[PDB]
């Protein structure tokens, strides 16, 4: 039921947990906002997360951890997100994989969450979450040939965008596609 990813991204020290949550919440508010409210693009949020991830400043790491932990723990609610926000979420989730902001257990989990989304009905919101996330990290697929085999085995793989079919099939062979 409730997932708990605190072993990857520890909970903040109690002393400033309120402020860390509020800061994380603010970044998400901005990634989902529309003008005239303040916004941040997915690329801007990714740039910040890259700086924070292994920052020597505890507060920055704590906000990174809070954002990633909450994002991943939100997966079971993604189907409840409006289409606009779900798409932004997909781009962010795929970008996190693309930029190597998750490794080991969390990378495997991220890949699994994308794969499970792609298995949802063709044309569904979660299918499109999967496609958008996958397009962000497609240049990494050749490093995960068994993952590519699993993608190719999806019952509606033949309906994926052409370029993604190429990246996946060549990725099964640990290769780039013929053009990127």
């Amino acid at each position: 039921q409730q997932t708990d990813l605190s072993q990857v991204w520890p909970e903040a020290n109690q002393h400033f947990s309120k402020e860390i949550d509020d800061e994380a919440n603010s970044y998400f508010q901005r990634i989902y906002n529309h003008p005239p409210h303040p916004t941040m693009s997915v690329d801007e949020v990714l740039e910040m997360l890259q700086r924070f991830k292994d920052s020597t400043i505890k507060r920055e790491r704590e906000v990174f951890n809070c954002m990633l932990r909450n994002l991943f723990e939100e997966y079971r609610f993604f189907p409840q997100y409006p289409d606009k926000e779900l798409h932004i979420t997909a781009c962010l989730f795929g970008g996190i994989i693309e930029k190597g902001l998750v490794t080991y257990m969390a990378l495997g989990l991220a890949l699994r969450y994308v794969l499970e989304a792609l298995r949802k009905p063709f044309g569904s919101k979660m299918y499109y979450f999967g496609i958008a996330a996958l397009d962000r990290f497609k240049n990494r697929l050749k490093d995960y040939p068994q993952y590519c085999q699993h993608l190719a085995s999806i019952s509606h793989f033949m309906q994926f965008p052409h370029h993604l079919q190429e990246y996946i099939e060549y990725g099964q062979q640990s290769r780039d596609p013929p053009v990127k």
């Binding site: 949550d21 998400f28 939100e74 409840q80 409006p82």
Partner: peptide, 12 residues
């Protein structure tokens, strides 16, 4: 443990 922003956008 959800952040308010996610409670807000979620249609439950």
């Amino acid at each position: 443990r959800r952040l308010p922003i996610f409670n807000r956008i979620s249609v439950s």
